[PDB]
Structure formats: C-alpha cells, structure tokens
C-alpha cells in the first residue's frame with residue numbers, strides 16, 4: 001500500500017541523508033515557491049501507524065491544522081517535510097521515530113519507536 005511505497009520508493013529529504021524522512025509527491029502543487037520559516041501554514045492531513053491503523057485526521061474535524069513553520073511546533077519530520085511543499089501539493093511522508101516521537105512515544109495513541117505515515121495537503125501559507 002501507500003506506506004510500503006513511500007518506504008521503498010520515496011525520496012530522502014533529510015539534510016543528514018539518514019533515511020529518517022521519506023517523501024513522495026502525490027499531487028503536484030502550484031509553481032515553485034515553498035513556505036519560508038515562520039510562515040503560518042494551513043494543512044489537511046491523515047496519519048497512520050505501522051499497525052495499519054489511522055490515528056488522526058484533520059479532514060474528519062472539518063478544519064485544517066495550522067502552525068508556524070520551522071519553529072518546532074510540530075515533530076521534526078513535519079517541519080522538514082512541509083518546508084518542501086508547494087501550495088496545493090499533496091504528499092506522502094514516512095517519518096522514522098527520530099523525526100517523530102522517539103522512544104517516548106506519545107500516549108495514548110503513539111507507541112514507542114513508531115514510524116509514522118502521513119498524507120499531507122498544503123492548503124496555503126502566509127507570512128504574518
């Protein structure tokens with residue numbers, strides 16, 4: 001399925017090249033511009049665990065998730081991955097635990113040492 005495909009066929013987008021964050025662009029976005037550090041970014045996403053279960057979805061809440069990029073407001077994989085996206089892009093990200101919740105996890109939902117899979121749509125970005 002899609003998690004296997006990004007695992008086996010995705011691009012390593014880490015500066016370290018440590019295969020910690022892998023990406024496939026699923027729906028090509030607009031032009032060339034990506035958000036810059038500190039921009040307010042609006043996304044829709046879903047997340048799955050490696051047991052095959054969906055653990056979260058913004059779609060199901062009927063509103064996007066909004067954060068300030070590159071500030072550590074989200075897991076490292078998200079700051080890295082969203083920074084690569086164009087407006088309107090949909091991607092798949094595979095996030096090893098070192099770029100997510102690590103050995104601690106985040107109970108109740110995120111186990112220790114969890115590799116996370118996301119589908120992410122970048123709706124918009126704006127400077128404040």
Ligand SMILES: COCCO[C@H]1CN(CCOC)C(=O)[C@@H]2CCC[C@H]1N2S(=O)(=O)c1cc(Cl)cc(Cl)c1
Nearest residue numbers: 045047055056065073074075078106107109110116
């Ligand atoms: C109901 O909350 C939905 C948005 O949750 C964020 C949680 N965070 C920030 C806090 O942890 C550092 C995240 O970084 C990531 C990525 C952004 C979207 C959400 N997570 S998540 O999908 O990995 C997530 C979802 C849920 Cl339901 C619980 C936990 Cl612990 C993480």
